[PDB]
Amino acid sequence: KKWYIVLTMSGYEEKVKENIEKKVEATGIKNLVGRIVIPEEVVLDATSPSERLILSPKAKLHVNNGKDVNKGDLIAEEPPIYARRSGVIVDVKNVRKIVVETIDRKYTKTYYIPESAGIEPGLRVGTKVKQGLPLSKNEEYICELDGKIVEIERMKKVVVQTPDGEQDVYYIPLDVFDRDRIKKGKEVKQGEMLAEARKFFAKVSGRVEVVDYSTRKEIRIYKTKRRKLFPGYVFVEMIMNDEAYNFVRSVPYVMGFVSSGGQPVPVKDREMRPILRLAGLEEYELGFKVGDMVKIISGPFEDFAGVIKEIDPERQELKVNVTIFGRETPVVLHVSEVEKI
Incomplete structure:
Protein backbone atom coordinates (compact mmCIF):
# COMPACT_ATOMS: atom_id res chain seq x y z
CA LYS A 1 0.00 0.00 0.00
CA GLU A 40 15.71 4.11 -15.46
CA GLU A 41 16.49 7.11 -17.61
CA VAL A 42 16.21 6.62 -21.34
CA VAL A 43 18.92 8.56 -23.14
CA LEU A 44 19.59 8.99 -26.85
CA ASP A 45 22.20 6.59 -28.22
CA ALA A 46 22.06 7.01 -31.99
CA THR A 47 23.93 9.30 -34.33
CA SER A 48 21.10 8.86 -36.84
CA PRO A 49 17.64 7.17 -37.39
CA SER A 50 17.15 3.42 -37.22
CA GLU A 51 13.93 3.90 -39.05
CA ARG A 52 12.82 6.77 -41.22
CA LEU A 53 9.21 6.48 -42.30
CA ILE A 54 7.99 8.94 -44.92
CA LEU A 55 4.28 9.74 -44.93
CA SER A 56 1.67 11.89 -46.60
CA PRO A 57 0.94 15.27 -44.99
CA LYS A 58 -2.54 13.87 -44.27
CA ALA A 59 -1.12 10.94 -42.28
CA LYS A 60 -2.56 10.68 -38.78
CA LEU A 61 0.39 10.25 -36.40
CA HIS A 62 -0.07 8.17 -33.27
CA VAL A 63 3.25 9.37 -31.90
CA ASN A 64 5.10 12.65 -31.31
CA ASN A 65 8.58 14.15 -30.88
CA GLY A 66 10.48 12.81 -27.88
CA LYS A 67 8.11 9.86 -27.48
CA ASP A 68 9.61 6.42 -26.87
CA VAL A 69 8.16 3.44 -28.74
CA ASN A 70 8.46 -0.37 -28.90
CA LYS A 71 9.19 -2.44 -32.01
CA GLY A 72 5.52 -3.19 -32.64
CA ASP A 73 3.67 -0.04 -31.76
CA LEU A 74 1.32 1.66 -34.17
CA ILE A 75 3.08 4.89 -35.02
CA ALA A 76 0.95 6.24 -37.84
CA GLU A 77 -2.02 5.77 -40.11
CA GLU A 78 -2.68 6.87 -43.69
CA PRO A 79 -6.37 7.63 -44.45
CA PRO A 80 -8.41 5.76 -47.07
CA ILE A 81 -8.59 7.06 -50.60
CA TYR A 82 -11.90 8.41 -51.86
CA ALA A 83 -13.15 9.12 -55.36
CA ARG A 84 -13.44 12.88 -55.61
CA ARG A 85 -15.84 12.62 -58.51
CA SER A 86 -18.13 10.08 -60.16
CA GLY A 87 -16.95 8.46 -63.38
CA VAL A 88 -15.50 5.38 -65.02
CA ILE A 89 -11.97 4.04 -64.66
CA VAL A 90 -10.27 4.50 -68.02
CA ASP A 91 -6.78 3.42 -67.04
CA VAL A 92 -5.08 1.42 -64.34
CA LYS A 93 -1.32 1.37 -64.65
CA ASN A 94 1.54 -0.17 -62.71
CA VAL A 95 3.88 2.59 -61.68
CA ARG A 96 6.87 2.94 -59.36
CA LYS A 97 6.97 5.99 -57.09
CA ILE A 98 10.48 7.25 -56.45
CA VAL A 99 10.82 10.10 -54.03
CA VAL A 100 14.11 12.04 -54.22
CA GLU A 101 15.39 14.32 -51.45
CA THR A 102 17.83 16.89 -52.79
CA ILE A 103 20.81 18.51 -51.08
CA ASP A 104 18.90 21.79 -51.23
CA ARG A 105 16.85 19.91 -48.60
CA LYS A 106 13.44 21.23 -47.53
CA TYR A 107 11.15 19.61 -50.10
CA THR A 108 11.18 16.47 -52.15
CA LYS A 109 10.84 15.41 -55.80
CA THR A 110 8.40 12.59 -56.55
CA TYR A 111 8.73 10.54 -59.73
CA TYR A 112 6.36 8.00 -61.26
CA ILE A 113 8.07 5.61 -63.62
CA PRO A 114 5.70 3.29 -65.52
CA GLU A 115 6.76 -0.28 -64.76
CA SER A 116 6.55 -0.97 -68.52
CA ALA A 117 9.60 1.29 -68.86
CA GLY A 118 11.68 -1.02 -66.66
CA ILE A 119 12.78 0.36 -63.31
CA GLU A 120 16.55 0.66 -63.22
CA PRO A 121 18.12 -2.20 -61.27
CA GLY A 122 20.13 -0.79 -58.38
CA LEU A 123 17.59 1.75 -57.21
CA ARG A 124 16.99 1.61 -53.46
CA VAL A 125 16.17 3.93 -50.59
CA GLY A 126 19.56 5.49 -49.92
CA THR A 127 20.71 5.47 -53.54
CA LYS A 128 22.40 8.64 -54.76
CA VAL A 129 21.16 9.98 -58.08
CA LYS A 130 22.38 12.71 -60.41
CA GLN A 131 20.84 14.70 -63.25
CA GLY A 132 20.95 12.93 -66.60
CA LEU A 133 21.07 9.54 -64.92
CA PRO A 134 18.08 7.53 -66.17
CA LEU A 135 15.64 6.05 -63.69
CA SER A 136 13.99 3.88 -66.34
CA LYS A 137 15.88 0.97 -67.92
CA ASN A 138 15.35 2.63 -71.29
CA GLU A 139 14.90 6.26 -72.30
CA GLU A 140 12.39 8.74 -70.91
CA TYR A 141 12.14 9.38 -67.18
CA ILE A 142 15.62 10.69 -66.46
CA CYS A 143 16.53 12.21 -63.09
CA GLU A 144 16.39 16.02 -63.21
CA LEU A 145 17.85 16.68 -59.77
CA ASP A 146 20.83 15.35 -57.84
CA GLY A 147 19.75 13.81 -54.54
CA LYS A 148 19.00 10.55 -52.76
CA ILE A 149 16.01 8.24 -52.83
CA VAL A 150 14.10 8.39 -49.54
CA GLU A 151 11.19 6.27 -50.74
CA ILE A 152 10.42 3.89 -53.54
CA GLU A 153 7.04 2.26 -53.66
CA ARG A 154 4.96 0.25 -56.10
CA MET A 155 1.63 1.81 -56.97
CA LYS A 156 -1.28 1.64 -59.33
CA LYS A 157 -2.10 4.73 -61.31
CA VAL A 158 -5.89 4.95 -61.52
CA VAL A 159 -7.47 7.39 -63.95
CA VAL A 160 -11.14 8.09 -63.43
CA GLN A 161 -12.85 9.93 -66.25
CA THR A 162 -15.86 12.14 -65.73
CA PRO A 163 -18.92 11.98 -68.03
CA ASP A 164 -17.99 15.25 -69.73
CA GLY A 165 -14.39 14.13 -70.20
CA GLU A 166 -12.36 15.52 -67.30
CA GLN A 167 -10.07 13.26 -65.27
CA ASP A 168 -8.98 12.46 -61.72
CA VAL A 169 -5.74 10.63 -61.13
CA TYR A 170 -5.09 8.56 -58.06
CA TYR A 171 -2.00 6.65 -57.05
CA ILE A 172 -2.96 3.53 -55.09
CA PRO A 173 -0.26 1.94 -52.97
CA LEU A 174 -0.01 -1.60 -54.43
CA ASP A 175 -0.44 -3.40 -51.11
CA VAL A 176 -3.92 -1.85 -50.80
CA PHE A 177 -4.82 -2.26 -54.46
CA ASP A 178 -8.22 -3.94 -54.77
CA ARG A 179 -8.70 -5.77 -58.09
CA ASP A 180 -12.48 -5.82 -58.01
CA ARG A 181 -12.98 -2.18 -57.04
CA ILE A 182 -10.16 -0.94 -59.25
CA LYS A 183 -10.27 -2.11 -62.84
CA LYS A 184 -10.50 -0.52 -66.27
CA GLY A 185 -14.13 -0.07 -67.23
CA LYS A 186 -15.61 0.08 -63.75
CA GLU A 187 -17.95 2.79 -62.57
CA VAL A 188 -16.75 4.64 -59.51
CA LYS A 189 -19.02 6.91 -57.49
CA GLN A 190 -18.20 10.10 -55.63
CA GLY A 191 -17.33 9.33 -52.03
CA GLU A 192 -16.48 5.72 -52.84
CA MET A 193 -13.46 4.35 -51.03
CA LEU A 194 -11.06 3.30 -53.78
CA ALA A 195 -8.61 2.03 -51.19
CA GLU A 196 -8.51 1.42 -47.45
CA ALA A 197 -6.38 3.15 -44.85
CA ARG A 198 -2.88 1.91 -44.04
CA LYS A 199 -1.30 1.35 -40.64
CA PHE A 200 2.37 1.63 -39.73
CA PHE A 201 4.24 0.12 -36.83
CA ALA A 202 7.65 0.85 -35.40
CA LYS A 203 10.16 -1.32 -37.25
CA VAL A 204 12.42 -0.66 -34.28
CA SER A 205 12.28 0.45 -30.62
CA GLY A 206 13.61 3.89 -29.67
CA ARG A 207 12.83 7.60 -29.48
CA VAL A 208 10.73 9.18 -32.20
CA GLU A 209 11.38 12.44 -33.94
CA VAL A 210 8.77 13.70 -36.40
CA VAL A 211 9.16 16.24 -39.19
CA ASP A 212 5.88 17.99 -39.94
CA TYR A 213 5.90 19.68 -43.34
CA SER A 214 3.22 20.65 -45.85
CA THR A 215 5.07 18.49 -48.38
CA ARG A 216 5.28 15.41 -46.16
CA LYS A 217 5.46 13.96 -42.68
CA GLU A 218 8.27 11.81 -41.34
CA ILE A 219 8.72 9.57 -38.35
CA ARG A 220 12.32 8.90 -37.41
CA ILE A 221 13.11 6.41 -34.65
CA TYR A 222 16.48 6.57 -32.89
CA LYS A 223 18.18 3.89 -30.83
CA THR A 224 18.16 4.87 -27.17
CA LYS A 225 20.07 3.66 -24.12
CA ARG A 226 18.77 3.11 -20.59
CA ARG A 227 20.58 4.19 -17.41
CA LYS A 228 19.59 3.18 -13.88
CA LEU A 229 19.20 6.45 -12.00
CA LEU A 286 19.19 31.57 -22.02
CA GLY A 287 22.91 31.85 -21.22
CA PHE A 288 23.29 28.79 -18.97
CA LYS A 289 26.76 27.84 -17.82
CA VAL A 290 28.38 24.77 -16.29
CA GLY A 291 28.02 25.07 -12.51
CA ASP A 292 24.92 27.24 -12.84
CA MET A 293 22.21 26.58 -10.24
CA VAL A 294 18.88 25.89 -11.94
CA LYS A 295 15.39 24.85 -10.96
CA ILE A 296 13.62 22.04 -12.79
CA ILE A 297 10.22 23.39 -13.72
CA SER A 298 8.89 20.54 -15.81
CA GLY A 299 9.03 16.76 -16.02
CA PRO A 300 9.68 13.85 -13.62
CA PHE A 301 12.09 15.98 -11.64
CA GLU A 302 9.86 19.05 -11.59
CA ASP A 303 10.26 21.28 -8.53
CA PHE A 304 13.81 20.08 -7.88
CA ALA A 305 16.89 22.25 -7.55
CA GLY A 306 19.98 21.32 -9.53
CA VAL A 307 23.43 22.17 -10.81
CA ILE A 308 24.31 22.26 -14.49
CA LYS A 309 27.11 19.82 -15.13
CA GLU A 310 27.08 19.22 -18.87
CA ILE A 311 25.58 21.39 -21.62
CA ASP A 312 24.63 20.30 -25.14
CA PRO A 313 23.42 23.18 -27.33
CA GLU A 314 22.26 22.43 -30.88
CA ARG A 315 20.21 19.90 -28.93
CA GLN A 316 19.14 22.23 -26.14
CA GLU A 317 19.98 19.56 -23.57
CA LEU A 318 21.42 19.76 -20.06
CA LYS A 319 22.95 17.24 -17.69
CA VAL A 320 22.17 18.53 -14.22
CA ASN A 321 23.01 17.05 -10.85
CA VAL A 322 20.07 16.78 -8.50
CA THR A 323 19.87 15.56 -4.93
CA ILE A 324 17.24 12.93 -4.18
CA PHE A 325 17.51 10.52 -1.27
CA GLY A 326 20.64 12.46 -0.37
CA ARG A 327 22.11 11.07 -3.57
CA GLU A 328 23.91 13.19 -6.15
CA THR A 329 22.09 12.26 -9.35
CA PRO A 330 22.77 13.39 -12.92
CA VAL A 331 19.62 13.86 -14.94
CA VAL A 332 19.28 14.74 -18.59
CA LEU A 333 16.56 17.15 -19.70
CA HIS A 334 15.68 20.01 -22.05
CA VAL A 335 16.63 23.64 -21.43
CA SER A 336 12.92 24.34 -21.68
CA GLU A 337 12.56 22.48 -18.37
CA VAL A 338 14.85 24.61 -16.24
CA GLU A 339 15.27 28.14 -14.88
CA LYS A 340 18.49 29.91 -13.95
CA ILE A 341 17.21 31.02 -10.53
Whole structure:
Protein backbone atom coordinates (compact mmCIF):
# COMPACT_ATOMS: atom_id res chain seq x y z
CA LYS A 1 0.00 0.00 0.00
CA LYS A 2 3.11 2.20 0.16
CA TRP A 3 6.50 2.75 -1.47
CA TYR A 4 9.71 1.52 0.09
CA ILE A 5 13.24 1.35 -1.15
CA VAL A 6 14.84 -2.05 -1.02
CA LEU A 7 18.61 -2.12 -0.98
CA THR A 8 20.54 -4.47 -3.26
CA MET A 9 24.05 -4.56 -4.63
CA SER A 10 24.66 -2.02 -7.37
CA GLY A 11 23.69 -3.76 -10.60
CA TYR A 12 21.52 -6.51 -9.06
CA GLU A 13 18.24 -4.58 -9.05
CA GLU A 14 16.68 -6.56 -11.86
CA LYS A 15 17.38 -9.90 -10.18
CA VAL A 16 15.71 -8.73 -6.98
CA LYS A 17 12.58 -7.67 -8.88
CA GLU A 18 12.42 -11.03 -10.61
CA ASN A 19 13.05 -12.94 -7.39
CA ILE A 20 10.36 -11.03 -5.56
CA GLU A 21 7.93 -11.60 -8.41
CA LYS A 22 8.75 -15.30 -8.42
CA LYS A 23 8.45 -15.69 -4.66
CA VAL A 24 5.00 -14.13 -4.95
CA GLU A 25 4.16 -16.77 -7.54
CA ALA A 26 5.71 -19.82 -5.88
CA THR A 27 4.08 -18.81 -2.63
CA GLY A 28 0.60 -17.59 -3.51
CA ILE A 29 0.93 -14.58 -1.25
CA LYS A 30 -0.38 -11.93 -3.64
CA ASN A 31 -1.71 -9.34 -1.19
CA LEU A 32 1.62 -7.99 0.07
CA VAL A 33 3.54 -6.65 -2.89
CA GLY A 34 2.10 -4.43 -5.59
CA ARG A 35 4.19 -2.59 -8.17
CA ILE A 36 7.98 -2.72 -8.34
CA VAL A 37 9.98 -0.02 -10.08
CA ILE A 38 13.63 0.30 -11.11
CA PRO A 39 13.94 3.98 -12.15
CA GLU A 40 15.71 4.11 -15.46
CA GLU A 41 16.49 7.11 -17.61
CA VAL A 42 16.21 6.62 -21.34
CA VAL A 43 18.92 8.56 -23.14
CA LEU A 44 19.59 8.99 -26.85
CA ASP A 45 22.20 6.59 -28.22
CA ALA A 46 22.06 7.01 -31.99
CA THR A 47 23.93 9.30 -34.33
CA SER A 48 21.10 8.86 -36.84
CA PRO A 49 17.64 7.17 -37.39
CA SER A 50 17.15 3.42 -37.22
CA GLU A 51 13.93 3.90 -39.05
CA ARG A 52 12.82 6.77 -41.22
CA LEU A 53 9.21 6.48 -42.30
CA ILE A 54 7.99 8.94 -44.92
CA LEU A 55 4.28 9.74 -44.93
CA SER A 56 1.67 11.89 -46.60
CA PRO A 57 0.94 15.27 -44.99
CA LYS A 58 -2.54 13.87 -44.27
CA ALA A 59 -1.12 10.94 -42.28
CA LYS A 60 -2.56 10.68 -38.78
CA LEU A 61 0.39 10.25 -36.40
CA HIS A 62 -0.07 8.17 -33.27
CA VAL A 63 3.25 9.37 -31.90
CA ASN A 64 5.10 12.65 -31.31
CA ASN A 65 8.58 14.15 -30.88
CA GLY A 66 10.48 12.81 -27.88
CA LYS A 67 8.11 9.86 -27.48
CA ASP A 68 9.61 6.42 -26.87
CA VAL A 69 8.16 3.44 -28.74
CA ASN A 70 8.46 -0.37 -28.90
CA LYS A 71 9.19 -2.44 -32.01
CA GLY A 72 5.52 -3.19 -32.64
CA ASP A 73 3.67 -0.04 -31.76
CA LEU A 74 1.32 1.66 -34.17
CA ILE A 75 3.08 4.89 -35.02
CA ALA A 76 0.95 6.24 -37.84
CA GLU A 77 -2.02 5.77 -40.11
CA GLU A 78 -2.68 6.87 -43.69
CA PRO A 79 -6.37 7.63 -44.45
CA PRO A 80 -8.41 5.76 -47.07
CA ILE A 81 -8.59 7.06 -50.60
CA TYR A 82 -11.90 8.41 -51.86
CA ALA A 83 -13.15 9.12 -55.36
CA ARG A 84 -13.44 12.88 -55.61
CA ARG A 85 -15.84 12.62 -58.51
CA SER A 86 -18.13 10.08 -60.16
CA GLY A 87 -16.95 8.46 -63.38
CA VAL A 88 -15.50 5.38 -65.02
CA ILE A 89 -11.97 4.04 -64.66
CA VAL A 90 -10.27 4.50 -68.02
CA ASP A 91 -6.78 3.42 -67.04
CA VAL A 92 -5.08 1.42 -64.34
CA LYS A 93 -1.32 1.37 -64.65
CA ASN A 94 1.54 -0.17 -62.71
CA VAL A 95 3.88 2.59 -61.68
CA ARG A 96 6.87 2.94 -59.36
CA LYS A 97 6.97 5.99 -57.09
CA ILE A 98 10.48 7.25 -56.45
CA VAL A 99 10.82 10.10 -54.03
CA VAL A 100 14.11 12.04 -54.22
CA GLU A 101 15.39 14.32 -51.45
CA THR A 102 17.83 16.89 -52.79
CA ILE A 103 20.81 18.51 -51.08
CA ASP A 104 18.90 21.79 -51.23
CA ARG A 105 16.85 19.91 -48.60
CA LYS A 106 13.44 21.23 -47.53
CA TYR A 107 11.15 19.61 -50.10
CA THR A 108 11.18 16.47 -52.15
CA LYS A 109 10.84 15.41 -55.80
CA THR A 110 8.40 12.59 -56.55
CA TYR A 111 8.73 10.54 -59.73
CA TYR A 112 6.36 8.00 -61.26
CA ILE A 113 8.07 5.61 -63.62
CA PRO A 114 5.70 3.29 -65.52
CA GLU A 115 6.76 -0.28 -64.76
CA SER A 116 6.55 -0.97 -68.52
CA ALA A 117 9.60 1.29 -68.86
CA GLY A 118 11.68 -1.02 -66.66
CA ILE A 119 12.78 0.36 -63.31
CA GLU A 120 16.55 0.66 -63.22
CA PRO A 121 18.12 -2.20 -61.27
CA GLY A 122 20.13 -0.79 -58.38
CA LEU A 123 17.59 1.75 -57.21
CA ARG A 124 16.99 1.61 -53.46
CA VAL A 125 16.17 3.93 -50.59
CA GLY A 126 19.56 5.49 -49.92
CA THR A 127 20.71 5.47 -53.54
CA LYS A 128 22.40 8.64 -54.76
CA VAL A 129 21.16 9.98 -58.08
CA LYS A 130 22.38 12.71 -60.41
CA GLN A 131 20.84 14.70 -63.25
CA GLY A 132 20.95 12.93 -66.60
CA LEU A 133 21.07 9.54 -64.92
CA PRO A 134 18.08 7.53 -66.17
CA LEU A 135 15.64 6.05 -63.69
CA SER A 136 13.99 3.88 -66.34
CA LYS A 137 15.88 0.97 -67.92
CA ASN A 138 15.35 2.63 -71.29
CA GLU A 139 14.90 6.26 -72.30
CA GLU A 140 12.39 8.74 -70.91
CA TYR A 141 12.14 9.38 -67.18
CA ILE A 142 15.62 10.69 -66.46
CA CYS A 143 16.53 12.21 -63.09
CA GLU A 144 16.39 16.02 -63.21
CA LEU A 145 17.85 16.68 -59.77
CA ASP A 146 20.83 15.35 -57.84
CA GLY A 147 19.75 13.81 -54.54
CA LYS A 148 19.00 10.55 -52.76
CA ILE A 149 16.01 8.24 -52.83
CA VAL A 150 14.10 8.39 -49.54
CA GLU A 151 11.19 6.27 -50.74
CA ILE A 152 10.42 3.89 -53.54
CA GLU A 153 7.04 2.26 -53.66
CA ARG A 154 4.96 0.25 -56.10
CA MET A 155 1.63 1.81 -56.97
CA LYS A 156 -1.28 1.64 -59.33
CA LYS A 157 -2.10 4.73 -61.31
CA VAL A 158 -5.89 4.95 -61.52
CA VAL A 159 -7.47 7.39 -63.95
CA VAL A 160 -11.14 8.09 -63.43
CA GLN A 161 -12.85 9.93 -66.25
CA THR A 162 -15.86 12.14 -65.73
CA PRO A 163 -18.92 11.98 -68.03
CA ASP A 164 -17.99 15.25 -69.73
CA GLY A 165 -14.39 14.13 -70.20
CA GLU A 166 -12.36 15.52 -67.30
CA GLN A 167 -10.07 13.26 -65.27
CA ASP A 168 -8.98 12.46 -61.72
CA VAL A 169 -5.74 10.63 -61.13
CA TYR A 170 -5.09 8.56 -58.06
CA TYR A 171 -2.00 6.65 -57.05
CA ILE A 172 -2.96 3.53 -55.09
CA PRO A 173 -0.26 1.94 -52.97
CA LEU A 174 -0.01 -1.60 -54.43
CA ASP A 175 -0.44 -3.40 -51.11
CA VAL A 176 -3.92 -1.85 -50.80
CA PHE A 177 -4.82 -2.26 -54.46
CA ASP A 178 -8.22 -3.94 -54.77
CA ARG A 179 -8.70 -5.77 -58.09
CA ASP A 180 -12.48 -5.82 -58.01
CA ARG A 181 -12.98 -2.18 -57.04
CA ILE A 182 -10.16 -0.94 -59.25
CA LYS A 183 -10.27 -2.11 -62.84
CA LYS A 184 -10.50 -0.52 -66.27
CA GLY A 185 -14.13 -0.07 -67.23
CA LYS A 186 -15.61 0.08 -63.75
CA GLU A 187 -17.95 2.79 -62.57
CA VAL A 188 -16.75 4.64 -59.51
CA LYS A 189 -19.02 6.91 -57.49
CA GLN A 190 -18.20 10.10 -55.63
CA GLY A 191 -17.33 9.33 -52.03
CA GLU A 192 -16.48 5.72 -52.84
CA MET A 193 -13.46 4.35 -51.03
CA LEU A 194 -11.06 3.30 -53.78
CA ALA A 195 -8.61 2.03 -51.19
CA GLU A 196 -8.51 1.42 -47.45
CA ALA A 197 -6.38 3.15 -44.85
CA ARG A 198 -2.88 1.91 -44.04
CA LYS A 199 -1.30 1.35 -40.64
CA PHE A 200 2.37 1.63 -39.73
CA PHE A 201 4.24 0.12 -36.83
CA ALA A 202 7.65 0.85 -35.40
CA LYS A 203 10.16 -1.32 -37.25
CA VAL A 204 12.42 -0.66 -34.28
CA SER A 205 12.28 0.45 -30.62
CA GLY A 206 13.61 3.89 -29.67
CA ARG A 207 12.83 7.60 -29.48
CA VAL A 208 10.73 9.18 -32.20
CA GLU A 209 11.38 12.44 -33.94
CA VAL A 210 8.77 13.70 -36.40
CA VAL A 211 9.16 16.24 -39.19
CA ASP A 212 5.88 17.99 -39.94
CA TYR A 213 5.90 19.68 -43.34
CA SER A 214 3.22 20.65 -45.85
CA THR A 215 5.07 18.49 -48.38
CA ARG A 216 5.28 15.41 -46.16
CA LYS A 217 5.46 13.96 -42.68
CA GLU A 218 8.27 11.81 -41.34
CA ILE A 219 8.72 9.57 -38.35
CA ARG A 220 12.32 8.90 -37.41
CA ILE A 221 13.11 6.41 -34.65
CA TYR A 222 16.48 6.57 -32.89
CA LYS A 223 18.18 3.89 -30.83
CA THR A 224 18.16 4.87 -27.17
CA LYS A 225 20.07 3.66 -24.12
CA ARG A 226 18.77 3.11 -20.59
CA ARG A 227 20.58 4.19 -17.41
CA LYS A 228 19.59 3.18 -13.88
CA LEU A 229 19.20 6.45 -12.00
CA PHE A 230 19.85 4.92 -8.56
CA PRO A 231 22.11 1.87 -8.44
CA GLY A 232 21.21 -0.49 -5.61
CA TYR A 233 17.67 0.79 -5.12
CA VAL A 234 14.49 -1.13 -5.84
CA PHE A 235 11.23 0.69 -5.24
CA VAL A 236 8.59 -1.72 -4.22
CA GLU A 237 4.97 -0.92 -3.43
CA MET A 238 3.83 -2.99 -0.45
CA ILE A 239 1.95 -3.11 2.81
CA MET A 240 4.48 -2.98 5.60
CA ASN A 241 4.19 -5.40 8.49
CA ASP A 242 6.09 -8.35 9.94
CA GLU A 243 5.03 -10.65 7.09
CA ALA A 244 5.55 -8.22 4.22
CA TYR A 245 8.89 -7.19 5.73
CA ASN A 246 10.14 -10.74 6.17
CA PHE A 247 8.58 -11.72 2.87
CA VAL A 248 10.68 -9.23 0.88
CA ARG A 249 13.70 -8.98 3.23
CA SER A 250 14.47 -12.68 2.83
CA VAL A 251 14.59 -12.54 -0.94
CA PRO A 252 17.98 -13.54 -2.38
CA TYR A 253 20.12 -10.45 -2.99
CA VAL A 254 17.82 -8.24 -0.96
CA MET A 255 20.24 -6.51 1.41
CA GLY A 256 17.77 -4.49 3.45
CA PHE A 257 15.52 -1.45 3.40
CA VAL A 258 16.23 2.23 3.62
CA SER A 259 15.13 2.84 7.19
CA SER A 260 15.88 5.20 10.06
CA GLY A 261 15.37 3.06 13.14
CA GLY A 262 13.00 0.11 13.02
CA GLN A 263 10.24 -0.63 10.53
CA PRO A 264 11.28 0.82 7.10
CA VAL A 265 10.44 4.35 6.01
CA PRO A 266 7.81 4.81 3.23
CA VAL A 267 9.22 7.23 0.62
CA LYS A 268 8.23 10.87 1.06
CA ASP A 269 5.69 11.86 -1.62
CA ARG A 270 7.95 14.65 -2.86
CA GLU A 271 10.84 12.24 -3.36
CA MET A 272 8.75 9.50 -5.03
CA ARG A 273 7.12 11.73 -7.64
CA PRO A 274 10.02 11.67 -10.10
CA ILE A 275 10.17 7.87 -9.68
CA LEU A 276 6.51 7.52 -10.60
CA ARG A 277 6.73 9.93 -13.56
CA LEU A 278 9.82 8.22 -14.91
CA ALA A 279 7.87 4.99 -14.46
CA GLY A 280 4.96 6.28 -16.52
CA LEU A 281 2.85 5.62 -13.44
CA GLU A 282 1.84 9.25 -13.13
CA GLU A 283 0.60 11.24 -16.11
CA TYR A 284 2.26 14.64 -15.84
CA GLU A 285 2.38 17.97 -17.69
CA LEU A 286 19.19 31.57 -22.02
CA GLY A 287 22.91 31.85 -21.22
CA PHE A 288 23.29 28.79 -18.97
CA LYS A 289 26.76 27.84 -17.82
CA VAL A 290 28.38 24.77 -16.29
CA GLY A 291 28.02 25.07 -12.51
CA ASP A 292 24.92 27.24 -12.84
CA MET A 293 22.21 26.58 -10.24
CA VAL A 294 18.88 25.89 -11.94
CA LYS A 295 15.39 24.85 -10.96
CA ILE A 296 13.62 22.04 -12.79
CA ILE A 297 10.22 23.39 -13.72
CA SER A 298 8.89 20.54 -15.81
CA GLY A 299 9.03 16.76 -16.02
CA PRO A 300 9.68 13.85 -13.62
CA PHE A 301 12.09 15.98 -11.64
CA GLU A 302 9.86 19.05 -11.59
CA ASP A 303 10.26 21.28 -8.53
CA PHE A 304 13.81 20.08 -7.88
CA ALA A 305 16.89 22.25 -7.55
CA GLY A 306 19.98 21.32 -9.53
CA VAL A 307 23.43 22.17 -10.81
CA ILE A 308 24.31 22.26 -14.49
CA LYS A 309 27.11 19.82 -15.13
CA GLU A 310 27.08 19.22 -18.87
CA ILE A 311 25.58 21.39 -21.62
CA ASP A 312 24.63 20.30 -25.14
CA PRO A 313 23.42 23.18 -27.33
CA GLU A 314 22.26 22.43 -30.88
CA ARG A 315 20.21 19.90 -28.93
CA GLN A 316 19.14 22.23 -26.14
CA GLU A 317 19.98 19.56 -23.57
CA LEU A 318 21.42 19.76 -20.06
CA LYS A 319 22.95 17.24 -17.69
CA VAL A 320 22.17 18.53 -14.22
CA ASN A 321 23.01 17.05 -10.85
CA VAL A 322 20.07 16.78 -8.50
CA THR A 323 19.87 15.56 -4.93
CA ILE A 324 17.24 12.93 -4.18
CA PHE A 325 17.51 10.52 -1.27
CA GLY A 326 20.64 12.46 -0.37
CA ARG A 327 22.11 11.07 -3.57
CA GLU A 328 23.91 13.19 -6.15
CA THR A 329 22.09 12.26 -9.35
CA PRO A 330 22.77 13.39 -12.92
CA VAL A 331 19.62 13.86 -14.94
CA VAL A 332 19.28 14.74 -18.59
CA LEU A 333 16.56 17.15 -19.70
CA HIS A 334 15.68 20.01 -22.05
CA VAL A 335 16.63 23.64 -21.43
CA SER A 336 12.92 24.34 -21.68
CA GLU A 337 12.56 22.48 -18.37
CA VAL A 338 14.85 24.61 -16.24
CA GLU A 339 15.27 28.14 -14.88
CA LYS A 340 18.49 29.91 -13.95
CA ILE A 341 17.21 31.02 -10.53
